[model samples]
Target: HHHHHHVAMSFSGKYQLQSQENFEAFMKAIGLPEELIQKGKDIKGVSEIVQNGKHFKFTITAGSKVIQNEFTVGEECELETMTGEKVKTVVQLEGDNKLVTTFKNIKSVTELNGDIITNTMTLGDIVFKRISKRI
Candidate 1:
């Protein structure tokens, strides 16, 4: 007799930003305006990731801004950034719990561990890192 099931980690959950590092510097380096960067620095945004097989739907919202993007792994698609700008990019999944993507010369990596999600965006030598917890 045996009991077995295909249970695995899923990235389908809503996570709210807990803390961030170097948010202003990163935003400024990306050509975002002064006012927008200041206004968004302290905002606790929420990210909703809906993953189905090889397809993924991402929605991020903070204050009055919302950006939504949908794409399949290994395919190039137009994705909206935090600055309300769109760029065509490819999102790749590494291992089983990480998302790796690049847009506008910035490399972004998001990894999930249990109920925590860590996101890091790098532009040149600057990195804006943030942590979120599932709620």
Candidate 2:
């Protein structure tokens, strides 16, 4: 016997890292080790970020690995903590020449999960919801 399930979704967007520094900062903020960064830097044409409203996917072409993260936004959204606990908080927005969104009280990888999966790391529950209007 075979079982099948249907999943419905709508709308999608891609949020690429505007700069290497910003991407690196994001990695560090999420508790990625310096070694991973150095490894990623050695690869060519293998880093990128793609996001839909409910799902975010990252690809490292050089290593042939893709990491997908599921998230929700809004006033009641909760983040899964390191202890597998859920924390509630509002997302914060910050930027100058570039756009950055930060989620408060979020745990880093070291605090939440001991191991890092890929070169790209997520920053808090908050994410780059959309591109900057100026651009």
Among all candidates shown, the one with the greatest TM-score: 1
Please report the TM-score between candidate 2 and the true structure: 0.33
The local distance difference test score of model 1 is 0.86
On lDDT, the candidate that comes out on top is: 1
Which tens-of-lDDT digit does each residue in 20-96 have in candidate 1? 99988998888878988898877778999877777889888885788899988888988888777898998999886
Inter-residue clash pairs, candidate 2: none
TM-scores for all predictions: 0.89, 0.33
Model 1 misplaced regions, further than 4 Å: 1-7
lDDT agreement with native, every candidate: 0.86, 0.33
Clash counts per candidate, in order, are 0, 0
Model 2 poorest 10 in a row by lDDT: 110-119
